[PDB]
């Protein structure tokens, strides 16, 4: 074999084995020089005394192949050396290996504690015990040989490099290179191999990194294009501030261009409110930020936002801003900063980077990680199969109508734990504590009556009865320690009764029957995740921990942030936050007190943490989870007529655009008020007429049973109800008018690709609904526990404006109200289970979680002033919820849409659900050869001047140097920076002119030669449109400059021509695999993105009617609000990825100090409606973010897995396109016939896997090709003869037999 035969053929003459260990074994062999009775095939323990250990393991070392022992290469000093014989009998024995795993695990404890002088001398004894490991193991294996060296396995490289660093950091360099001292923690990666089952997850981790090489180069190319695109349209724009006018009547002189600049550069003359560390941005566009009326909105004054780290002023900062946007990390702050200064039409830049960045390329990262883990599981499951190859109590207690009684008591008891809250009555508190004594007395009597009818030989076997017996013994110790004011945490084990119900409703029991089955897979991934988080938390604490203390003055107020690197627990939490997807806020504070080396740290903890480890958790969830009869003829013909249905669709679309135009400022448009009024009368007659036409066509029983017609019937009733109100008195309800938007989901379901997108949503809703119910259950356990920890503890004494007092001034609520301050509660507060649910939603979506977790770790006791970080171990509550509620329940929605979309695409393509995967690879290869046509060549002309021009046009050396000059034209754009000198820009505009004249030459060669066929290639249009506008921008001396040609529009066409390089990436294999999956999925990815816009239209119009008049709180202000349609689409697109929904919630639920709507004065009221705001955002976040954004990951997983499967077994569409690029040069006129003599030259000119090697004529006659008249053969007969050749040699000639039956049944 490759490894199983080469390692044995090298044992023949080169170097043999030395020893083996399979269940306490240690042999003594040699390299066929002087071996003394080790083993030939004796399987016995007669000769030696030490070979008896390696004698009974003859049936254990041959388990799978050789996966039981390891073999040294005895080739340097093995025999006649008594020292090296001890070294084999030291390395092999397991007590030497379990001694190091204790030594590493003790050494990791001394890292999480702050060091001292006794830590140093204890550090020195670990450094001399790891030298003993190296000096023994090098002595038994040799330093570097070709067989089996010490520096050959990459677990000894980490053993050796970390030991050599512990010499350098302990004899010299005590001030310089502090950084290398922190990489002695990488030795703790070796303790992965102590948790059983690790080789499945580590080998999937290694395979994921090496299979992302083709995608990291494609992602770095796409970040390059988006950063140059962001550089050319956004440099200088984040420095736009409202600046005060130069004072006309007064000081600062009269006027001078030096005194104007002196006045304007002053920071005191720039507009800030009496808050807001950063300054607000303005713009001169029609929907940008507006200045107060003494200001003028200038560009170029005083620093970029976020300490200067958020800009497009240079290529490197544009590269960080674009990477922040694809990675989706606080992007709504970059999004709102960009549209406030450039205007709202720049939402188009953000749509393009989100669509191709996070909805495509971060979903190719998930697909590679899923394929890597699935391939490692099928390797392990295949190998595991090779391992395989008292009398009356019984009528009462065992009654099925008695088990129903306990199921009532449990649901009653779960309700009484959720009804417990802060500041209740006495009589309400008396019911809950009396219900405790009843429910425990029921549970005791049940456990006695089930051990008298099921005597305790049998009771303790059921494994629910022994769980229930633990509940009863906790209830009596709670009852005995009831009056005691001692420990009293036994009363916290009342939460464990909630899992006793799982016994009854089965989809909770079937949910937990998976976790108790595949628990070893979850343990290996959780331990590897927490081991990575440990390694990063010690490195960053020693790299960056001292900068926070030494440079504390650079932070605002001169105080440490909540998130820092000063000790281990802060360092673990700031690294855990980056795995949840938030890293740039912790990296701004790191670069402020530190150097540049915070940027490689926070990308690597994001790349390993979020993109690889959490995607491995999703991969592990997939694998485990007579006039009456003539009228019904006319109405039936109208209902089926095609021109009638286009009219009905057109009315519904035109009328819904009218519904987006009614907003604020509508009573100032009095003509538009009358337009929308008469439309409501035409529609309330249109809906009635179209209902009675469909009621005579379809009938009664087929009308009122359809789901689209019940939706249709409600809109008819809603416009008859609004009709009879306006005919008698009452003005029409505006909510019932908006029900006509639902009429346009049925024309949306017929747009040529929405059959797969809507069927994977209708079929997913009973699966989504059971995951909601299991989600509501597990969050209920954490919601009760958060009430029992934090109810009443989020109060604090506050100043007159917003400031929390110190605890030295105000100690309690007595001190706060004696000094006339305000004792105030937090808006997210854990005061009852309903508030806890809304709090646990913000910690699971990671939007708002930072303020909830500040209040939890500052909490002391009821009526005490909170002190910062006074119980910092309350972080353990939030880690345990994020792992089991966010990382496990919310990613289970992605698993649902992946499985259903595999089914609904197999249904739509006509395929069967009874053919295996190997039978469908064979069918796809037959469907493609029958839909294949030869490509006709572009004709060569005859006049001498224009024929040469054709010959140099089609040349590949011309097409290569045409691509180099496009890459050179755009790399010059990447060195534009903000503030460049005028002599720098004159160099780059003379170099730009010599590129326009070259691109004008190669455009006219490709039109003189290679005629009107030129305009069929989609990239020759953009190559033509740029060169025309570039000559027009330089010619015409009288450049108008009044809106003539945008310099932005000219610079987008330069960058858009780089997409020709996606055609030249079709030479690299892994890139060609990955662009093909994007090309085949691009129709159904657009259909998801067009369903998404129709859902956004529904929430825009309803949100414009609920939240048009609310006052500016939270994240809602004079730019971002629900006042118009265009401004609603700005918010709901941000809200579609859940980014910043906590501050939108704070304004659309704000009902504290709000004016009431007065109908007589004509005042709308600015108030919030908390109840309607919860049902707006939570309904939006679960529809648009959990099931429709996760639809992008369902589609890309199904097309990437299809294309990679054709690379391994099938034929991959580009290899059909490969066939007709070489059929073309032997059949140029599309005759679709070549002669018999040419096919020996054609079969060699092919590419793998479709090429036939020379000598061809030995292999040509082996296959039968039906030759037509005059030695002419057909392309279909050649191609079908080659597909049979490909499927003959891959697996077996038996699997060549399964492809004729598609070739016969279809032809």
């Amino acid at each position: 074999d490759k490894g199983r035969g080469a390692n044995k053929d090298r044992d023949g003459s080169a170097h043999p084995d030395q020893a083996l260990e399979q269940g306490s074994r240690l042999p003594a062999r040699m390299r066929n020089i002087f071996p003394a009775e080790l083993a030939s095939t004796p399987l016995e323990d007669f000769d030696p005394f030490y070979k008896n250990k390696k004698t009974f393991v003859v049936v254990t070392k041959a388990g799978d192949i050789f996966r039981f022992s390891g073999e040294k290469s005895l080739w340097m000093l093995d025999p006649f050396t008594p020292i090296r014989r001890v070294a084999i009998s030291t390395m092999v024995q397991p007590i030497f290996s379990y001694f190091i795993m204790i030594t590493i695990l003790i050494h990791c404890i001394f890292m999480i504690m702050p060091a001292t002088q006794t830590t140093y001398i204890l550090e020195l004894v670990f450094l001399s015990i790891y030298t003993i490991e190296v000096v023994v193991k090098v002595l038994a294996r040799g330093f570097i040989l070709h067989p089996f060296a010490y520096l050959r396995d990459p677990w000894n490289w980490l053993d050796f490099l970390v030991t050599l660093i512990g010499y350098i950091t302990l004899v010299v360099d005590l001030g310089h290179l502090y950084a290398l001292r922190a990489f002695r923690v990488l030795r703790s990666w070796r303790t992965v191999t102590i948790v059983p089952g690790w080789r499945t997850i580590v080998d999937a981790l290694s395979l994921s990194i090496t299979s992302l090489k083709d995608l990291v180069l494609l992602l770095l190319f796409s970040l390059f294009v988006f950063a140059v695109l962001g550089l050319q349209i956004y440099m200088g724009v984040l420095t736009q501030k409202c600046v005060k006018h130069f004072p006309a009547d007064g000081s600062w002189g009269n006027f001078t261009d030096e005194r104007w600049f002196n006045y304007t550069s002053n920071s005191s003359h720039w507009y800030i409110p009496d808050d807001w560390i950063e300054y607000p941005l303005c713009g001169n566009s029609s929907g940008a930020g507006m200045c107060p009326p003494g200001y003028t909105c200038l560009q170029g004054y005083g620093g970029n936002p976020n300490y200067g780290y958020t800009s497009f002023d240079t290529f490197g900062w544009a590269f960080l801003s674009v990477f922040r946007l694809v990675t989706l990390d606080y992007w709504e702050d970059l999004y709102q900063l960009a549209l406030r200064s450039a205007g709202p039409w720049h939402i188009l830049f953000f749509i393009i980077v989100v669509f191709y960045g996070t909805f495509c390329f971060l979903n190719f990262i998930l697909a590679v990680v899923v394929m890597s883990y699935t391939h490692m599981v099928k390797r392990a499951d295949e190998e595991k199969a090779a391992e395989r190859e008292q009398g009356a109590i019984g009528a009462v207690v065992l009654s099925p109508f008695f088990e129903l009684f306990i199921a009532v008591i449990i649901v009653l008891n779960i309700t009484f734990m959720a009804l417990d809250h802060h500041d209740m009555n006495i009589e309400f508190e008396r019911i809950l504590r009396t219900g405790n004594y009843i429910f425990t007395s029921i549970y005791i009597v049940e456990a006695v009556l089930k051990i008298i009818a099921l005597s305790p030989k049998f009771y303790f076997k059921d494994s629910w009865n022994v769980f229930d017996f633990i509940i009863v013994v906790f209830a009596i110790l709670e009852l005995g320690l009831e009056g005691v004011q001692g420990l009293s945490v036994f009363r916290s084990f009342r939460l464990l009764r909630v899992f006793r119900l799982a016994k009854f409703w089965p989809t909770l029991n079937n949910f937990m029957s998976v976790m108790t089955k595949s628990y070893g897979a979850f343990v290996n991934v959780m331990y590897v995740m927490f081991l990575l988080l440990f390694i990063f938390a010690i490195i960053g604490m020693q790299l960056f921990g001292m900068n926070y203390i030494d440079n504390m003055e650079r932070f605002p107020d001169g105080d440490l942030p909540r998130w820092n690197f000063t000790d281990f627990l802060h360092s673990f939490m700031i690294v855990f936050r980056a795995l949840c997807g938030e890293w740039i806020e912790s990296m701004w504070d790191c670069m402020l007190v530190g150097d540049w080396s915070c940027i490689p740290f926070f990308v690597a903890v994001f790349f390993v943490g979020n993109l690889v480890i959490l995607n491995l958790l999703i991969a592990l969830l997939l694998n485990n989870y007579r006039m009456w009869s003539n009228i019904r003829r006319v109405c039936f013909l109208l209902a089926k007529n095609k021109y009638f249905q286009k009219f009905v669709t057109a009315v519904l679309v035109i009328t819904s655009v009218l519904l987006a135009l009614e907003d604020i400022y509508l009573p100032q448009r009095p003509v538009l008020v009358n337009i929308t009024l008469y439309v409501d009368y035409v529609l309330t007659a249109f809906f009635v007429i179209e209902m009675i036409i469909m009621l005579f066509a379809v009938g009664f029983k087929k009308y009122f049973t359809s789901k689209w017609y019940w939706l249709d019937f409600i809109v008819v009733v809603a416009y008859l109800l609004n009709f009879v109100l306006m005919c008698a008195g009452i003005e029409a309800l505006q909510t019932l008018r908006l029900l006509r938007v639902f009429r346009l989901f049925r024309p949306l379901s017929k747009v040529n690709g929405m059959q797969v997108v809507t069927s994977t949503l209708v079929e997913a809703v009973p699966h989504i609904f059971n995951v909601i119910l299991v989600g509501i259950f597990f969050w209920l356990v954490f919601a009760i526990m958060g009430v029992q920890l934090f109810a009443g503890k989020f109060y604090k004494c506050v100043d007159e404006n917003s400031t929390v007092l110190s605890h030295e001034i105000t100690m309690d609520r007595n001190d706060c109200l004696h000094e006339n301050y305000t004792w105030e509660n937090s808006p997210m507060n854990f005061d009852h289970v309903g508030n806890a649910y809304l709090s646990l939603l913000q910690v699971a979506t990671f939007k708002g979680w930072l303020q909830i977790m500040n209040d939890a770790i500052d909490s002391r006791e009821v009526h005490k002033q909170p002190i910062r970080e006074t119980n910092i171990y309350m972080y353990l509550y939030f880690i345990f919820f994020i792992v089991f509620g966010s990382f496990f329940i919310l990613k289970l929605f992605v698993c649902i849409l992946i499985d259903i979309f595999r089914q609904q695409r197999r249904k739509a393509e006509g395929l069967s659900a009874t053919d295996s995967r190997t039978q469908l690879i064979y069918r796809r290869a037959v469907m493609r050869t029958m839909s294949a046509k030869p490509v006709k060549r572009i004709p060569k002309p005859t006049c001498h001047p224009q024929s040469l021009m054709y010959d140099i046009s089609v040349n590949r050396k011309f097409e290569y140097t045409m691509m180099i000059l496009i890459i050179l034209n755009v790399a010059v754009m990447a060195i534009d920076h903000y503030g460049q000198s005028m002599e720098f820009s004159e160099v780059l505009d003379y170099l730009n002119l010599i590129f326009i004249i070259i691109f004008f030459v190669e455009c006219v060669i490709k039109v003189s030669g290679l005629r009107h066929h030129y305009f069929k290639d989609p990239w020759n249009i953009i190559d033509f449109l740029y060169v025309v506008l570039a000559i027009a921008g330089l010619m015409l001396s009288d450049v108008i400059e009044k809106y003539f040609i945008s310099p932005t529009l000219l610079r987008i066409l330069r960058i858009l021509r780089v997409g020709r390089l996606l055609r030249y990436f079709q030479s690299a294999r892994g890139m060609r695999l990955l662009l093909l999956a994007l090309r085949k999925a691009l129709r159904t990815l657009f259909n998801v993105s067009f369903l998404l816009f129709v859902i956004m239209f529904v929430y825009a119009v309803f949100g414009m009617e609920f939240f048009m008049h609310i006052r500016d709180a939270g994240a809602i202000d004079d730019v971002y609000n629900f006042k118009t349609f265009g401004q609603s689409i700005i918010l709901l697109f941000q809200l579609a990825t859940s980014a910043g929904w906590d501050g939108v919630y704070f304004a659309i639920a704000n009902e504290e100090d709000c004016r009431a709507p007065d109908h007589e004065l004509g005042y709308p009221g600015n108030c919030g409606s908390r109840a309607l705001g919860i049902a707006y955002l939570v309904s939006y976040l679960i529809i648009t973010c959990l099931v429709v954004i996760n639809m992008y990951a369902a589609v890309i997983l199904d097309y990437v897995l299809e294309v990679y499967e054709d690379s391994k077994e099938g034929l991959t569409d580009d290899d059909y396109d490969m066939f007709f690029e070489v059929w073309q040069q032997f059949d140029p006129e599309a005759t679709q016939y070549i002669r018999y003599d040419q096919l020996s030259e054609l079969l060699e000119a092919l590419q793998p896997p479709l090429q036939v090697q020379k000598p061809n004529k030995y292999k040509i006659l082996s296959m039968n090709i039906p030759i037509c008249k005059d030695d002419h053969i057909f392309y279909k007969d050649v191609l079908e003869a080659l597909v049979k050749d490909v499927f003959s040699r891959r697996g077996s000639p038996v699997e060549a037999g399964d492809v004729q039956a598609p070739n016969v049944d279809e032809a």
Partner: protein, 56 residues
């Protein structure tokens, strides 16, 4: 007015004192105005509550 005005019968319970709804004053002069009292049960641990005269 003075901090500690009972405003009720004798044997009544003041602010922040345990009670059983039979011993609770009608009002109380605490923090610069007259505030009523009602015996409410506040959160004081896991499924534990201490019932105390609290202002409403």
């Amino acid at each position: 007015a003075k901090d500690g005005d009972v405003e009720g019968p004798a044997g009544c319970k003041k602010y922040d004192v345990e009670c059983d709804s039979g011993e609770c004053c009608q009002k109380q002069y605490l923090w610069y105005k007259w505030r009523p009292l009602d015996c409410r049960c506040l959160k004081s641990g896991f499924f534990s509550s201490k019932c105390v005269c609290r202002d409403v």
